[PDB]
Amino acid sequence: SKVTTVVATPGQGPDRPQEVSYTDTKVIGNGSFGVVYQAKLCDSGELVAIKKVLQDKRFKNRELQIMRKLDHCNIVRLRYFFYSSGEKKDEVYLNLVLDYVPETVYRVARHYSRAKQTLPVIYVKLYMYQLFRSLAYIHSFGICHRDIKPQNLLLDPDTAVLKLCDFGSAKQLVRGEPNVSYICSRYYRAPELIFGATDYTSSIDVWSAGCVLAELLLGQPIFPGDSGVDQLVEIIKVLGTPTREQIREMNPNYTEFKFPQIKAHPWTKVFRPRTPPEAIALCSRLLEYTPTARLTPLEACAHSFFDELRDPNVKLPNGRDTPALFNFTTQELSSNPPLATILIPPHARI
Amino acid sequence: MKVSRDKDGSKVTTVVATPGQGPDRPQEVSYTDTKVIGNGSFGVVYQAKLCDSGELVAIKKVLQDKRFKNRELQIMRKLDHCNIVRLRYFFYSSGEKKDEVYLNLVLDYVPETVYRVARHYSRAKQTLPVIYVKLYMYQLFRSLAYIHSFGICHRDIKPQNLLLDPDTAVLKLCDFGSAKQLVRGEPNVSYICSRYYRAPELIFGATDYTSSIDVWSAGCVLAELLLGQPIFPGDSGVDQLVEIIKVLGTPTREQIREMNPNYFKFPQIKAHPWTKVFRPRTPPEAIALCSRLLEYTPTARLTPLEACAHSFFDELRDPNVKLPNGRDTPALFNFTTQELSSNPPLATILIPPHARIQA
Numbered sequence A: 001s002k003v004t005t006v007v008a009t010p011g012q013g014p015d016r017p018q019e020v021s022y023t024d025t026k027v028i029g030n031g032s033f034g035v036v037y038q039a040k041l042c043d044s045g046e047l048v049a050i051k052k053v054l055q056d057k058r059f060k061n062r063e064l065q066i067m068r069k070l071d072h073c074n075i076v077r078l079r080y081f082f083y084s085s086g087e088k089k090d091e092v093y094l095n096l097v098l099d100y101v102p103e104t105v106y107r108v109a110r111h112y113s114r115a116k117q118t119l120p121v122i123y124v125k126l127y128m129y130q131l132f133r134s135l136a137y138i139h140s141f142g143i144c145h146r147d148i149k150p151q152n153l154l155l156d157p158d159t160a161v162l163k164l165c166d167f168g169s170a171k172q173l174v175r176g177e178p179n180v181s182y183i184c185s186r187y188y189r190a191p192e193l194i195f196g197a198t199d200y201t202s203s204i205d206v207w208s209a210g211c212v213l214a215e216l217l218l219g220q221p222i223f224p225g226d227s228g229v230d231q232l233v234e235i236i237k238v239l240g241t242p243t244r245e246q247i248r249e250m251n252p253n254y255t256e257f258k259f260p261q262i263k264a265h266p267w268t269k270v271f272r273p274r275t276p277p278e279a280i281a282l283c284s285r286l287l288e289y290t291p292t293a294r295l296t297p298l299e300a301c302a303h304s305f306f307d308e309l310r311d312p313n314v315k316l317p318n319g320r321d322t323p324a325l326f327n328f329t330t331q332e333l334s335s336n337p338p339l340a341t342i343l344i345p346p347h348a349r350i
Numbered sequence B: 001m002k003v004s005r006d007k008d009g010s011k012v013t014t015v016v017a018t019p020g021q022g023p024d025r026p027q028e029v030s031y032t033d034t035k036v037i038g039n040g041s042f043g044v045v046y047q048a049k050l051c052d053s054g055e056l057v058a059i060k061k062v063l064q065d066k067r068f069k070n071r072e073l074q075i076m077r078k079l080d081h082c083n084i085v086r087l088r089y090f091f092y093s094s095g096e097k098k099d100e101v102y103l104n105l106v107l108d109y110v111p112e113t114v115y116r117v118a119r120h121y122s123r124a125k126q127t128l129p130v131i132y133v134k135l136y137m138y139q140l141f142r143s144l145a146y147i148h149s150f151g152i153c154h155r156d157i158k159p160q161n162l163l164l165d166p167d168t169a170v171l172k173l174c175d176f177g178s179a180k181q182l183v184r185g186e187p188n189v190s191y192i193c194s195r196y197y198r199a200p201e202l203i204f205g206a207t208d209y210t211s212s213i214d215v216w217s218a219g220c221v222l223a224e225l226l227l228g229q230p231i232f233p234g235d236s237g238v239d240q241l242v243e244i245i246k247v248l249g250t251p252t253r254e255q256i257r258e259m260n261p262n263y264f265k266f267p268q269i270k271a272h273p274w275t276k277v278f279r280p281r282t283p284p285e286a287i288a289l290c291s292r293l294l295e296y297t298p299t300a301r302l303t304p305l306e307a308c309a310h311s312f313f314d315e316l317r318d319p320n321v322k323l324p325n326g327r328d329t330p331a332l333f334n335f336t337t338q339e340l341s342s343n344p345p346l347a348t349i350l351i352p353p354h355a356r357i358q359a
């Protein structure tokens, strides 16, 4: 019954701090940057995640700046933020108070692989669709996540709601500005990243999404490797050897450097039999060498693989209705507004 | 597998093999009891028993591009050193893919790796006796002094590529599949080397890196053998640089220039005292060596040969030094002119008085 009370600034709206009291503080996670706690708001009894990172008081926190602009049902909500000091004197910590979300795609996928089963396709559809909406939204602001991986896909198992989280690697990509190639986790890195390109687009997130789709179908990572070399060999084993043109599209400086000559492995034979053709088709349009050839997130949402989600009789296996799938805004559809006639089916929102 | 026969039940494979070193006088080689001991992205390693001598060999089988000559082969053919796994002979064959050529490298079989040994001690919540840390690392630094003296950078120094005889304490560097001759001015790919062992210039995507990346990697192996876990783990380069920065502290503008000139936004963190990184009673000489290997500035790192001459290895130069199991240490002082070429005067430290005594 130990209560902590802070004066915390709401994430959205005007910069108007209020007194916030919370209790039942326990460490849900540790990342390189800092610790994540669970806590219960005293007023509502609602559970929150508090992400605590060391802050260079001088400069502004990019993660905070980005999350204050984000309002989407498939992105974890910033409820408050506040500053605290401890450990070393003169060390200030930024605290992000987020909606608590009990599971991850990582943990749920790990359960099914440990028990020798695959995630039922209905969840692959729900989870990937919600990921592609969250990407469609941030990409419409020029914001690239740059760390799309199962650990950063939060899940409410009861409602089947997915929330994208962890904007610590996130950055507004501006044409002609170079960006670091050393972002994004091992198995989910786009080939242009592995080739050390600094002129990459938001399409790195689509490749990462494709790696998550493939992984949920296979029950293991599709492009594993301890080195970039090992990863590229695993990519080449599936896509075949990239053409000199395809290489120019990824990183032009790496044309003269050479790798084994291999023909593309048929996508249908990459996955087990009775993996739905539409799932396989979508993968092939996400995991493309040429960044500009990859589907956009919004195009991905409109893919036939997600048609079951647009069926008026679709239900969760636990009997509940699907979560919000169709509450698109103008911002979200801006990349291609005509897709609205596919994305919003006749039965939705009337 | 050119010709296959049966001998008292056992399957015998007979091949015609080109010798590793010497003129091309083909040798007839017969082996049995084939089993898999290793996999890679583009490689399979078998154990096999030679029919006559009964002695074990490793056969690394890799797909051969008909276009170009195999770089791993070209490099291994040039190498003769007691701390580098010997290419006995090589032969071509068919394999898993019909109409495809496979290069087979027949190597000395070595039963263990630093990876497997380190893992045994980690699981049992022990650390390797420091005499083994000294022997393994010293032998690694000799292997790197030798290849670097030909301008050849390994580019994949990691515990899994360090073969061990546990009884003799002999270490052999293996896996020249990433190895290349670095030529000042020629660019090189930044996506080589296993993730935990990658030098910061590689993480920053440099293409003008020197053989000193192998010294960083060996620094990571030493630290890991002292800690019982990787010193700089991370799923992303970002995560790895955070771990590096937590120890080394934030790199100066000039340190970043020395690593990759092209390259931002990392916490202003002060250096952790290296002493507080390792368990209490870690030999100070071990910690000093680490600090001189794991430097941001590639040129500031010790050369392999300077590493060998470091005070951490003084116990190896003691004339009364034995393995715990009572046996003599392996050869540590049989240096060649080639091996010493980077700094011949270091011989005055490297070859101890007792090793110069007249026979």
Ligand SMILES: Nc1ncnc2c1ncn2[C@@H]1O[C@H](COP(=O)(O)OP(=O)(O)NP(=O)(O)O)[C@@H](O)[C@H]1O
Binding pocket: A028, A029, A030, A031, A032, A033, A034, A035, A036, A049, A051, A076, A098, A099, A100, A101, A102, A104, A147, A151, A152, A154, A165, A166, A167, A168, A169, B239
């Ligand atoms: N809102 C939340 N609710 C519940 N768990 C959360 C929440 N946010 C983060 N976590 C958990 O804490 C982990 C780490 O949080 P994250 O936001 O990724 O911090 P980080 O320290 O920046 N990690 P990373 O950037 O991936 O190296 C996540 O993968 C989740 O398992």
Ligand SMILES: Nc1ncnc2c1ncn2[C@@H]1O[C@H](COP(=O)(O)OP(=O)(O)NP(=O)(O)O)[C@@H](O)[C@H]1O
Binding pocket: A230, B037, B038, B039, B040, B041, B042, B043, B044, B045, B057, B058, B060, B085, B107, B108, B109, B110, B111, B113, B160, B161, B163, B174, B175, B176, B177
């Ligand atoms: N001479 C040998 N004797 C015994 N085991 C060996 C020998 N050579 C290799 N191995 C084993 O096989 C593993 C792989 O060998 P390696 O030559 O690295 O092949 P690879 O398929 O190219 N692997 P890698 O490049 O690291 O991804 C080593 O880590 C050892 O465990």
Ligand SMILES: [Mg+2]
Binding pocket: A031, A151, A152, A165, A166
């Ligand atoms: Mg995360």
Ligand SMILES: [Mg+2]
Binding pocket: B160, B161, B175
């Ligand atoms: Mg290896």
